[PDB]
């Protein structure tokens, strides 16, 4: 129930997280997470119904999606929790995140194929099944398509934004959610997807296990924003077409609302999160 900075995991924790992920893949369960995310990303639109992305519920939706995945990990090994990747700090290819004992490194330049780590196609343990093209191997091009990860100063500028979200509650919005997501401003979450490259830049981005670690840090930043702005809360709070209001439920679960997900401490804590 404690989510830790990936950089701090012990060898034993890395081993167990890798093994649990690979068992979810083996059993078929992993791929359905990939499929759910692609379905939402292909349907979430600025001018119509939007729930997982480009909308206020981007944050609680990924919070609940990550909780679903963590619960599934824990069904294989109850000691495992999702670690987070602070890409403002661990910002080079040399970060131990990208070591062969954890996620493996960048892809080779001919075809982007990851050649080491537990998720390399050569292991036989990580087939890319849910996909948009014929290639069935994990690909990455770390720092290929955009040169730099967000910096701490850039993150702090986003965390200083006091309103959670603003009309029109989509990719054109001002406010914290959309600056964090990245469609406006110095760009935090979207740029990380672009920086990793490979499947992480596509609709089927959970094919790369770093998806979980990226979103666990995005989720941490929401928590940090709440601590800096105790007087700000999720919006909208009722009657908004096409958008999930505070007390409306969210697909695909239908049985949970943003209201049920604002307080992470009901589900987990972080290794470190300062008090306002």
């Amino acid at each position: 129930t404690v989510r830790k900075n990936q950089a701090t995991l012990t060898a034993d924790e890395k081993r167990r997280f890798v093994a649990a992920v690979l068992e979810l893949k083996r059993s078929g369960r992993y791929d359905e997470f990939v499929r759910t995310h692609n379905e939402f990303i292909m349907s979430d639109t600025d001018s119509g119904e939007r729930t997982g992305h480009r909308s206020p519920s981007f944050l609680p939706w990924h919070r609940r999606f990550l909780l679903d995945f963590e619960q599934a990990l824990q069904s294989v090994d109850s000691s495992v929790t999702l670690p987070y990747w602070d890409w403002s700090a661990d910002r080079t290819v040399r970060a131990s995140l990208w070591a062969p004992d954890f996620l493996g490194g960048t892809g080779r330049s001919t075809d982007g194929r990851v050649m080491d780590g537990p998720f390399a196609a050569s292991t036989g343990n990580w087939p890319i099944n849910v996909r948009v093209d014929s290639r069935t191997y994990l690909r990455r091009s770390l720092g290929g398509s955009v040169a730099e990860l967000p910096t701490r100063a850039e993150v702090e500028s986003v965390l200083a934004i006091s309103a959670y979200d603003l009309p029109p509650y989509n990719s054109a919005s001002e406010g914290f959610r959309n600056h964090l997501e990245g469609w406006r401003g110095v760009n935090l979450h979207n740029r990380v997807h672009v920086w990793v490259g490979g499947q992480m830049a596509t609709g089927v981005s959970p094919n790369d296990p770093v998806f979980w670690l990226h979103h666990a840090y995005v989720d941490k930043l929401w928590a940090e924003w709440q601590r800096r702005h105790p007087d700000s809360a999720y919006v909208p709070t009722g009657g908004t077409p096409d958008v999930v209001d505070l007390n409306e439920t969210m697909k695909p679960w239908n049985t949970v609302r943003p209201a049920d997900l604002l307080d992470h401490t009901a589900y987990y804590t972080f290794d470190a999160l300062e008090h306002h």
Binding site: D46, D133, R135, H189, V194, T202, G203
Partner: protein, 72 residues
């Protein structure tokens, strides 16, 4: 009004676009594309990376694919 249609060979592959609200094809296989509020575009193989037009999104998909057939 939607963007204009297009048809060209880019890096050896045929990319086509047409209003439908807009469809893109790479060698005759449909590529999911979406328009953002500000007028930019993305595709399913570049879904966190806005580019100004649908042809730009098609070209970005050909760049991403490195010769790979697109799946319907």
């Amino acid at each position: 009004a939607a963007p204009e249609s297009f048809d060209e060979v880019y890096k050896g592959r045929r990319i086509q676009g047409r209003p439908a609200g807009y469809e893109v094809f790479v060698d005759g296989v449909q590529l999911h594309v979406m328009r953002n509020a500000d007028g930019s575009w993305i595709s399913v193989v570049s879904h966190y990376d806005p580019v100004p037009t649908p042809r730009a999104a098609a070209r970005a998909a050909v760049d991403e694919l490195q010769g790979a057939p697109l799946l319907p």
